[PDB]
Amino acid sequence: GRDQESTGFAWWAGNARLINLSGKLLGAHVAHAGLIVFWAGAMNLFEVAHFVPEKPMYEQGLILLPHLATLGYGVGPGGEVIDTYPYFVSGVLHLISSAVLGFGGVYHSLVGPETLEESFPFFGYVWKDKNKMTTILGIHLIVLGLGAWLLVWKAMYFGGIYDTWAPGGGDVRIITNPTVSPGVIFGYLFRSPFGGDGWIVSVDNMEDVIGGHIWIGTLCIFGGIWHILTKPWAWARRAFVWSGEAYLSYSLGAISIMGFTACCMAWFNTTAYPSEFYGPTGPEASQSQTFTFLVRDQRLGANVASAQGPTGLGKYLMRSPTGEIIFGGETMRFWDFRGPWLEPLRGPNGLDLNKLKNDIQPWQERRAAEYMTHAPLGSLNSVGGVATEINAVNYVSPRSWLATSHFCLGFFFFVGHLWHAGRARAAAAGFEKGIDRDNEPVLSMRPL
Amino acid sequence: GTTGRIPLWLVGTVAGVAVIALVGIFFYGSYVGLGSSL
Amino acid sequence: KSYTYPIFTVRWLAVHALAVPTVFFLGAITAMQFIQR
Amino acid sequence: SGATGERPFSDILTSIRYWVIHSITIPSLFIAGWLFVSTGLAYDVFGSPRPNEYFTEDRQETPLITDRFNALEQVKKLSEV
Amino acid sequence: KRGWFDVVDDWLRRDRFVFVGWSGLLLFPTAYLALGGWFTGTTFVTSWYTHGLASSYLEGCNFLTAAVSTPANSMGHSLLFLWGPEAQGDFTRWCQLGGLWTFVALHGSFSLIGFMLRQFEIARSVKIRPYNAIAFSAPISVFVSVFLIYPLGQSGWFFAPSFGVAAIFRFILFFQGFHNWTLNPFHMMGVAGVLGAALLCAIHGATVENTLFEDGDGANTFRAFNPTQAEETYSMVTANRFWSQIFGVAFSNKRWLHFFMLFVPVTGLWMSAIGVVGLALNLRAYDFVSQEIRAAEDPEFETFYTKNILLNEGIRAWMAAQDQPHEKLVFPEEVLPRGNAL
Amino acid sequence: ESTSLWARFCEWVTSTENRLYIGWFGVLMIPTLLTATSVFIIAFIAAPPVDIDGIREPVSGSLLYGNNIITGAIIPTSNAIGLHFYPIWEAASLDEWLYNGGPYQLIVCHFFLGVCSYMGREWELSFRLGMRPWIAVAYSAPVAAATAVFIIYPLGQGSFSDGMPLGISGTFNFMIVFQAEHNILMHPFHMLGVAGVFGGSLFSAMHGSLVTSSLIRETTENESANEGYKFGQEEETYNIVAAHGYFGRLIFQYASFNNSRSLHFFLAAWPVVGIWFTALGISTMAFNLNGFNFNQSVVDSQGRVINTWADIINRANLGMEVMHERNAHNFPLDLA
Amino acid sequence: KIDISKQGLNSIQNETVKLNLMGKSKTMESKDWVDPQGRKGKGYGVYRFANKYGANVDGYSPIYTPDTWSESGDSYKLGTKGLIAWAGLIVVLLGVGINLVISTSALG
Ligand code: CLA
Ligand code: CLA
Ligand SMILES: CCCCCCCCCCCCCCCC(=O)OC[C@H](COP(=O)(O)OC[C@@H](O)CO)OC(=O)CCCCCCCCCCCCCCC
Ligand SMILES: CC1=C(/C=C/C(C)=C/C=C/C(C)=C/C=C/C=C(C)/C=C/C=C(C)/C=C/C2=C(C)CCCC2(C)C)C(C)(C)CCC1
Ligand SMILES: CC1=C(/C=C/C(C)=C\C=C\C(C)=C\C=C/C=C(C)\C=C\C=C(C)\C=C\C2=C(C)CCCC2(C)C)C(C)(C)CCC1
Ligand code: OEX
Ligand SMILES: [Cl-]
Ligand SMILES: [Cl-]
Ligand SMILES: [Fe+2]
């Protein structure tokens, strides 16, 4: 490789020596891609091996199998795992594919061309070439659009996607009428992120989920063709820093947002993250507790509608500040929660009192009872329950792992934007190494 | 006698592995035997 | 040109005053990991 | 800068003699630590209860030292097996 | 022909790898025993007969829960020597009596004196000013007040902080429940000192790194420096103008900035030490009587202070039975303050 | 030279001749921080009691309502609101907005935008002055901590009522309840946070004392040593080699930074990295990934549980748990 | 000033390591040198005030100076005789150590 003597970058900034070595930089990105596919394959096989059918997915610390289950692999009605062979071939296919991906990373890094600009003009690039940069942006934009179309093809032609809201119980369902209306799509995008609205985390149909991925697939393809046939305009040329480190900082800021959104998706959403596989959400578990005690106290004999708590508010049932009848207690904050087991008891005005005291099905009680005990509360060493609990249950919700981890990744990659974007501007301006001793800018300014 | 020196990076590597092994045993012992709640 | 250093010095005592007991204690703590209630 | 007259650590940690000597000394100290615990000597020297010695038939609750000038006698009775 | 003092002084103050000095005669013996006492206590010594707890690796604790626990409250403020009337020469019984705590506390307190004398000793030899020793008075004030003065004002060593991670956490939560130590204006000044010093450390380190002069052609700016360089490595003028336009006020004197970096942390720990001295006598800033009178008379007046007062009552009642086994507090559950449900 | 209004406006905004730099992040920072400052001062002095728990039990937090400076606070939004957006225009009356804890959301929302813009404004001035752009990165650590206790923790818990109250005694209530529900002391990230501030306090004292100890004699004893430094000096005001010699003998030669640039990076990295992790710790505990739970970890041969110091902590945690929000829980589990 | 020849780095086998430990770079001294990020140098080396002071912090106080190492450390004096005895002693102590661990445990 290189050294600090000829590059000025120490070993701990060693990968910064690849900024203008496009050929070696290619192998670096292909090799990390092989690692990602390797982890997906290795972790998939690890979870399949450690999978016992006597427990649900969320009780076994599995985070990849739920993603396969939501795609509708090896799951029967009600979120029951019937066969884990589809999970096996997913792990094997990734594991083997990482080998060839790893070979290309090692080849393009150690013994391939150092710079592609001479031998391979198609793949060669210089960061300053805005036209060439947009073509690469355009090309990889099309493959992302095609990847989105794979999801809708899976949901419409190849088996289908697991729908937790399906009539007759949650099951794998073919999506035949995706929601592609502009008002629905724009409604999710420009919705508030606050309570009740929840931005895009509040998508509650598989019709809307795969309806959106139709828009994303189409926009990315048209955007790919657009960014291939056009070079950036003057307004863009005078707004962005056109350097390799600058382009990296743009992506770091972008996937920081995506990391935070995935954190909130795993924590609140119950459609793309069915509770059958990822376990109950925070709001779901709190809502399940009052539902469980409402059911068991009715059998002991009590009018849940007329029951008062110590504070005077309804012990079991109260009204939200908008008027809907909701569960009482502290779970009054989670009144905007919607779940497959709870919607049948909910009418236009909120929870229906008649259905709550006459038509509570056993499966609804069992779901709420299970969700309450598997509430997303646990310790670092995976001790289930509140901090003031004994070492009895070994459980932490997959939602807790997914939300907690991808927030830390989201925040650190925001510091990546702050770091790599600050340095990109300074290096381009030309003072990333320090202030010129003979030409200090402040020395030429009027005193304050 | 025998001329030679152990490379420093090899010393760091073997010592680094031994430390990692020692920490792993401590974390292993956290889940078994005494102090494991079992 | 040629350097000859003493083997046992104040530094030697300091390094062994802390290293010897540590390795012993590390051995003792490792043995504790395999004790069953 | 300079040096204080001691041999450079890098020189000693790269020399063959050091590893020949410490390939026995360090392992032996570890084994001695292991035997100090496995032989039960750690319990006896420092008086920590064995996993089956916390409670007795006489005392099924936690000990309590309720005397200062007879604490030596009292702790012997609490520690009696 | 030199006398004993001169020949010994020559050897003690020899410029070796680890400087010994005259203060090393007090530091290294006591510091080694304090370190050894803690490692030995956390590995083999139990607190079963002093606190009714396990506090060693041999008993099954980990680094977080192992500790060198204090003697039982019946011992009072006994110095608890190996040869004292308690555990009269019996080493194993001495460990079971918590005598290792006073061993670590005492040999540890003389190590702090030895280390501070070491700072004076080296500074005089190197011919510099003694402001590092003065800065070290603040940690000594914290150790002296927390580990010595506070238990001396209480019933005994039992209520001193035990040398451990979780043991310190129990000591911390004890101070909230029983002393309302957060409300004390002296912990408040201590917090401002520690948080302010952490702010100064970060803000000064970043300011220097981002006002560095270009003294090289490499992106690695660490190499473009020489400890013997006469020119400054960073632009104070740029730094001063940056913080004047960002924060409104900035340092213009390099000497003042570094003294402030020393005054904030030291003053904070010293102020915090005064508060713990007050808690030694239970002379605590527990409550505001005016609000307590108002709250008692008006059952609808609630503030976050009154909410904290109820939290302290929960801490005291649910913790006293096990944290203070000498009191033999058998509280039936009906008498423990408990809110609705939970 | 510039004749266009926007060309002249953009020159004034980015002008480095202003007493306080405005910049483009300042057109966002100034209005948001002034809005939050105005309502905070007004609410801290004259706001009516706020029903924080949603149980129709208002909590007084204003000076004119019987609080002092220590006990005064801006009470968080009502638990009935939850995470729902509650601007003043979504309330029927300004009395209702005050009763439900409206001012808290107005402050927190505008304040979060202010610190994010303050962070960008720090980058912008560095770019305008031609200095290296990473003071804003060091400022991301306190921003993350402020964002964690005002936004992310309410987000995960499901209500703005679980945010940190804007007051002194309100802060203590936040910490005590946080320990009872998450065992933050046993979390490795508050442990890293404590090492960040204890270490940062140590390093600030050491660096300050070492530089002060090495001041080159340039004054008399009837004058402040500070007078020996002239603002704009091209030469060094203290002897770095002398300070390194002292600290080298204090522990050992290679435990000291001979390099001022490495030393100052360490002075910046240690507290910033520590505060990054403790900010993450609160963020992770927002989604109920609590600290270490070693309760009943040690059991004897026959199964009897031997208590440790962790169990004594649990006893204190138990007391806070059963007393916080006394009238708010109707069911045994504190899932919310 | 500082003399780099008397700093103990003269016997480094690798030239790049020797230059890095010396805080020197002949490549970066040229005014046509270009950074990996594309920035051209200003004619300074790793340190501009070098020559004035003699070296940078890297050459001022190295932490790896093989010139000051003892020549006796380059070889084991006992030679093959010691190594064979060392190899035999290792096996004997390994067997005793394993047996003592097995004997003093509840295993089997
Ligand atoms: C995803 C992680 C990753 C990847 C993909 C790379 C990739 C690369 N690095 Mg880098 N680096 C990394 C992490 C990574 N690095 C980290 C964490 C650090 C900090 C320690 C560094 C520090 C660093 C420095 C200082 C330098 C590089 C350099 C390089 C480039 C050339 C390396 C070389 O040729 O030397 C040769 C390496 C070897 C001969 C040993 C590796 C042999 C193989 C690759 C090991 C993998 C075996 C694998 C299991 C085989 C399976 C493949 C297939 C058969 C299935 C290369 C593209 C160099 C460079 O910039 O080029 C100018 C260089 O200067 N890196
Ligand atoms: C300079 C090192 C040093 C220092 C300052 C201390 C200090 C201390 N040790 Mg420690 N100790 C040390 C080294 C040191 N030790 C060493 C090397 C060991 C062996 C490993 C020990 C082992 C040890 C144990 C086992 C114990 C202590 C204990 C103590 C504490 C009380 C004991 C005491 O001083 O009573 C006696 C006071 C004096 C001796 C005053 C001395 C004044 C001079 C010497 C008088 C000259 C005598 C001379 C014959 C003149 C006769 C006068 C005539 C009137 C009789 C005390 C704070 C006890 C403790 O920890 O408390 C819990 C304890 O149990 N030490
Ligand atoms: C654009 C948005 C502006 C953001 C707001 C910034 C606030 C500015 C606050 C600075 C006022 C403090 C004056 C220090 C006194 C002063 O002006 O001295 C000025 C001093 C300059 O010292 P010199 O370097 O000139 O010293 C030369 C010698 O003569 C020293 O004596 O600046 C500093 O010391 C830096 C410390 C600033 C940090 C101040 C500490 C934080 C303020 C605490 C506020 C308390 C809270 C009140 C709430 C009710
Ligand atoms: C460049 C470079 C780098 C990196 C590299 C990389 C990152 C690579 C990767 C690589 C890779 C990424 C590789 C991979 C591989 C894979 C493979 C080779 C596979 C295998 C498989 C098998 C063999 C089989 C398996 C199986 C099945 C089939 C079923 C089940 C069962 C089992 C599991 C057995 C580094 C850092 C060093 C630095 C220097 C430079
Ligand atoms: C799939 C799906 C969906 C969705 C879809 C879509 C359609 C999305 C889109 C989205 C879009 C379509 C967009 C977004 C975003 C964008 C952004 C977020 C950004 C912006 C940025 C920036 C960066 C700006 C900048 C600026 C400019 C102007 C230039 C320079 C200067 C500045 C920098 C200032 C839904 C929901 C149905 C659900 C289901 C699934
Ligand atoms: O709101 Mn404020 O503090 Ca969070 O845990 Mn559940 O909810 Mn209520 O209780 Mn505990
Ligand atoms: Cl409370
Ligand atoms: Cl409740
Ligand atoms: Fe400084």
Swiss-Prot record, chain C:
**InterPro entries attached to this UniProt entry:** PSII_cyt_b559_bsu, PSII_cyt_b559_CS, PSII_cyt_b559_N
Q: Does the keyword Chloroplast apply?
A: yes
State one molecular function term (GO): iron ion binding
Give compartment(s): Plastid, Chloroplast thylakoid membrane
**Which biological process terms from the Gene Ontology are attached to this UniProt entry?**
photosynthetic electron transport chain
Quaternary structure and interacting proteins, as annotated: Heterodimer of an alpha subunit and a beta subunit. PSII is composed of 1 copy each of membrane proteins PsbA, PsbB, PsbC, PsbD, PsbE, PsbF, PsbH, PsbI, PsbJ, PsbK, PsbL, PsbM, PsbT, PsbX, PsbY, PsbZ, Psb30/Ycf12, at least 3 peripheral proteins of the oxygen-evolving complex and a large number of cofactors. It forms dimeric complexes.
Q: Which family does it belong to?
A: Belongs to the PsbE/PsbF family.
Q: What does this protein do, in the record's words?
A: This b-type cytochrome is tightly associated with the reaction center of photosystem II (PSII). PSII is a light-driven water:plastoquinone oxidoreductase that uses light energy to abstract electrons from H(2)O, generating O(2) and a proton gradient subsequently used for ATP formation. It consists of a core antenna complex that captures photons, and an electron transfer chain that converts photonic excitation into a charge separation.
Please state what the protein is called: Cytochrome b559 subunit beta
Query: What is the species listed in this Swiss-Prot or TrEMBL entry?
Result: Chlorella vulgaris (Green alga)
